[PDB]
Amino acid sequence: IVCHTTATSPISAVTCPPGENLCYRKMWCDAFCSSRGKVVELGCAATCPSKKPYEEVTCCSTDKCNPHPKQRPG
């Protein structure tokens, strides 16, 4: 229940202090992108404070939660 998991076993461990979220999966850009993947910087938070219209991913309920791996109806 931390920053970057990835599905399985070694991960879900130690990155930032205790609680929810930690490094939020917050989408976006701020001033500049011109980039491809496309989606997400990172922080140390446990809250979700800004975030309404255009707009961002959230507070994690879970290990990763996550953007944008994201494929097709398959």
Domains of the chain: 1-74 (2.10.60.10)
| Secondary structure string (H, E, C) spanning 33-57 | CCCCCCCCCCCCCCCCCCCCCCCCC
Report the structure determination method: NMR
* Locus of tokens 């992108």: 33
- 3-11 contacts: CB < 8 A, separation 24 or more? 3/42, 4/64, 5/63, 5/64, 5/66, 6/64, 7/64, 11/63
Amino acid at the residue 47: T
DSSP letter, residue 6: -
Q: How many other CB atoms are found less than 10 A from the CB of residue 51?
A: 15
Number of H helices, E strands in the chain: 0, 0
Q: What burial class does residue 26 get, using C-beta atoms within 10 Å of its C-beta: 0-12 exposed, 13-18 middle, 19+ buried? A: buried
Closest CA to 3 of 29, 35, 18: 18
